[PDB]
Design a protein around this ligand. Structure first.
Ligand SMILES: *[C@@H]1O[C@H](CO)[C@@H](O)[C@H](O)[C@H]1NC(C)=O
Ligand SMILES: *[C@@H]1O[C@H](CO)[C@@H](O)[C@H](O)[C@H]1NC(C)=O
Lengths: 99, 105
């Protein structure tokens, strides 16, 4: 077709170098962080990962912010539904809005 | 301030800089236990004040989260909120009352 801008850049001594970590390794690190956060909580950031059920981890998170932990154990289905709806809204806003 | 749970820090001077010695707390040796969110007793749900319910297979205890120090489950270290029909994963156990043996003596 016609000459590209990238070829004009490369023919005058300007080169783009590749990063050391590929996107597969960045996604692997992100997946490891997500798996540790989902299963263990904050225990994997201070040493060995210690398993806990996610409901009890979320009750710990509720006690952190000043709400008593029986609120989660009495509204667990509502809290899970609200989280799922918020994740779906993040999905829809990323599918529609491009700015 | 370092990796782990932070306790202390000590400064030292260096050529064009500073060196921090961070003293932190790391958990070391772990064990598996069976855990529950609440305890059903007398038609009531008991939740721990601070700590977590654990079981070694036979008996149920309450302990602090960052160190294994099991204790007898008592109304002093638990609070009551509602009945057992709304909590998912509630178990059946007895809750000790210190007033009852003092009343009989
Ligand atoms: C706990 O259970 C898991 C799965 O059965 C096992 O791999 C692990 O060795 C056990 N002990 C500790 C201290 O995590
Ligand atoms: C706990 O005891 C009640 C009766 O007091 C019984 O209906 C219920 O099934 C028991 N829970 C379990 C898990 O066996």
């Amino acid at each position: 077709a016609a000459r590209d801008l990238i070829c004009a850049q490369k023919f005058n001594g300007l080169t783009v170098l590749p990063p050391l970590l590929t996107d597969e390794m960045i996604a692997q690190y992100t997946s490891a962080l997500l798996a540790g956060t989902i299963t263990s909580g904050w225990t994997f950031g201070a040493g060995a990962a210690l398993q806990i059920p996610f409901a009890m981890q979320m009750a710990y998170r509720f006690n952190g912010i000043g709400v008593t932990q029986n609120v989660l154990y009495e509204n667990q289905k509502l809290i899970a539904n609200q989280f799922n709806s918020a994740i779906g809204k993040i999905q829809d806003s990323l599918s529609s809005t491009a700015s | 301030c370092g990796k782990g749970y932070h306790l202390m820090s000590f400064p030292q001077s260096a050529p064009h800089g500073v060196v921090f010695l961070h003293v932190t707390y790391v958990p070391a040796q772990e064990k598996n236990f069976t855990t529950a969110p609440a305890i059903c007793h007398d038609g009531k749900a008991h939740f721990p004040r601070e700590g977590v319910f654990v079981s070694n297979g036979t008996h149920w205890f309450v302990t602090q989260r960052n160190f294994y120090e099991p204790q007898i489950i008592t109304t002093d270290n638990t609070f009551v909120s509602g009945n057992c029909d709304v909590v998912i994963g509630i178990v059946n156990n007895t809750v000790y009352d210190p007033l009852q043996p003092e009343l009989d003596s």
